[PDB]
Write an enzyme that holds these catalytic residues in place. Structure first.
Site, PDB file in Angstrom:
ATOM      1  N   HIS A  83      77.396  50.849   0.450  1.00  0.00           N
ATOM      2  CA  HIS A  83      76.496  50.847   1.588  1.00  0.00           C
ATOM      3  C   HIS A  83      76.771  52.043   2.518  1.00  0.00           C
ATOM      4  O   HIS A  83      75.844  52.783   2.891  1.00  0.00           O
ATOM      5  CB  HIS A  83      76.639  49.501   2.343  1.00  0.00           C
ATOM      6  CG  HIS A  83      75.852  49.405   3.605  1.00  0.00           C
ATOM      7  ND1 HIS A  83      74.596  48.843   3.653  1.00  0.00           N
ATOM      8  CD2 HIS A  83      76.140  49.800   4.873  1.00  0.00           C
ATOM      9  CE1 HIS A  83      74.141  48.895   4.898  1.00  0.00           C
ATOM     10  NE2 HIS A  83      75.064  49.466   5.658  1.00  0.00           N
ATOM     11  N   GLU A  84      78.034  52.237   2.895  1.00  0.00           N
ATOM     12  CA  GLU A  84      78.359  53.326   3.815  1.00  0.00           C
ATOM     13  C   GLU A  84      78.032  54.690   3.230  1.00  0.00           C
ATOM     14  O   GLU A  84      77.600  55.588   3.950  1.00  0.00           O
ATOM     15  CB  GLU A  84      79.822  53.281   4.278  1.00  0.00           C
ATOM     16  CG  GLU A  84      80.246  51.962   4.912  1.00  0.00           C
ATOM     17  CD  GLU A  84      79.511  51.657   6.181  1.00  0.00           C
ATOM     18  OE1 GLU A  84      78.996  52.635   6.764  1.00  0.00           O
ATOM     19  OE2 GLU A  84      79.475  50.472   6.625  1.00  0.00           O
TER      20      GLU A  84
ATOM     21  N   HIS B 269      69.017  51.772   7.812  1.00  0.00           N
ATOM     22  CA  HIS B 269      68.834  50.391   7.378  1.00  0.00           C
ATOM     23  C   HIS B 269      67.461  50.002   6.826  1.00  0.00           C
ATOM     24  O   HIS B 269      66.437  50.363   7.399  1.00  0.00           O
ATOM     25  CB  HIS B 269      69.266  49.462   8.489  1.00  0.00           C
ATOM     26  CG  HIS B 269      70.746  49.442   8.661  1.00  0.00           C
ATOM     27  ND1 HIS B 269      71.363  49.382   9.889  1.00  0.00           N
ATOM     28  CD2 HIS B 269      71.740  49.552   7.748  1.00  0.00           C
ATOM     29  CE1 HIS B 269      72.674  49.413   9.723  1.00  0.00           C
ATOM     30  NE2 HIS B 269      72.928  49.526   8.434  1.00  0.00           N
TER      31      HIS B 269
ATOM     32  N   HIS C   7      74.725  55.706   3.907  1.00  0.00           N
ATOM     33  CA  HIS C   7      74.560  56.348   5.199  1.00  0.00           C
ATOM     34  C   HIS C   7      74.991  57.822   5.129  1.00  0.00           C
ATOM     35  O   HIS C   7      74.323  58.703   5.662  1.00  0.00           O
ATOM     36  CB  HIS C   7      75.323  55.616   6.330  1.00  0.00           C
ATOM     37  CG  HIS C   7      74.771  54.266   6.684  1.00  0.00           C
ATOM     38  ND1 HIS C   7      73.425  54.029   6.847  1.00  0.00           N
ATOM     39  CD2 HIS C   7      75.394  53.082   6.934  1.00  0.00           C
ATOM     40  CE1 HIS C   7      73.238  52.753   7.152  1.00  0.00           C
ATOM     41  NE2 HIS C   7      74.417  52.161   7.225  1.00  0.00           N
TER      42      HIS C   7
HETATM   43 ZN   LIG Z   1      74.774  50.005   7.553  1.00  0.00          ZN
END
Ligand SMILES: [Zn+2]
Ligand SMILES: [Ca+2]
Ligand SMILES: [Ca+2]
Ligand SMILES: [Ca+2]
Ligand SMILES: [Zn+2]
Length: 166
Positions: free
Chosen positions: A119-120, A129, A123
């Site tokens: 997930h990170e 999101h 980013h």
């Molecule tokens: Zn996040």
């Protein structure tokens, strides 16, 4: 999917990463494996490639931290914020920090390192999101056996970097 403002995007296809420190929670090999696997998730669906550094400034500097750790966003103790990562760019940009007040695990008995890392890194590559509850980029991730990148995540990352070459 959502893409960040003014589309901070890496201008290149090959990115470097560096694991700066290690958590007491897990054997070092488990941390490395979880990171490698998290990177593979994104590599498989784009032309992006990655390689590892053990010194110098890699694009994606990865570390474990607690409370105040050298940036303006101190971690908050057990639970809640698990990790955070900066959008593409130089210096601190692209970097990923993991809250060591969580208990990092290779399974689902604590906070799963692979899933949060994946997930990170999303980013770090410029994704924000998603509204799709089944997406890796949904704020609310958490059967690791049944983990699969959602079409929404693939759509988002390809909108930035395109599909795999051949
Ligand atoms: Zn996040
Ligand atoms: Ca926390
Ligand atoms: Ca960086
Ligand atoms: Ca810990
Ligand atoms: Zn931080």
């Amino acid at each position: 999917f959502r893409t960040f403002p003014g589309i901070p995007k890496w201008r290149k296809t090959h990115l470097t990463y560096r694991i700066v420190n290690y958590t007491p929670d897990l054997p070092k090999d488990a941390v490395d494996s979880a990171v490698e696997k998290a990177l593979k998730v994104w590599e498989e669906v784009t032309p992006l490639t990655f390689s590892r550094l053990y010194e110098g400034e890699a694009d994606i500097m990865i570390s474990f931290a607690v409370r105040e750790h050298g940036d303006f966003y101190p971690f908050d103790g057990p639970g809640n914020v698990l990790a955070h990562a900066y959008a593409p760019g130089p210096g601190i940009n692209g970097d990923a920090h993991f809250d060591d007040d969580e208990q990092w695990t290779k399974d689902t008995t604590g906070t799963n390192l692979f899933l949060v890392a994946a997930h990170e890194i999303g980013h770090s590559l410029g994704l924000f999101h998603s509204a799709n509850t089944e997406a890796l980029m949904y704020p609310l991730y958490h059967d690791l056996t049944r983990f699969r990148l959602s079409q929404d995540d693939i759509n988002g990352i390809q909108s930035l970097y395109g599909p795999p070459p051949d």
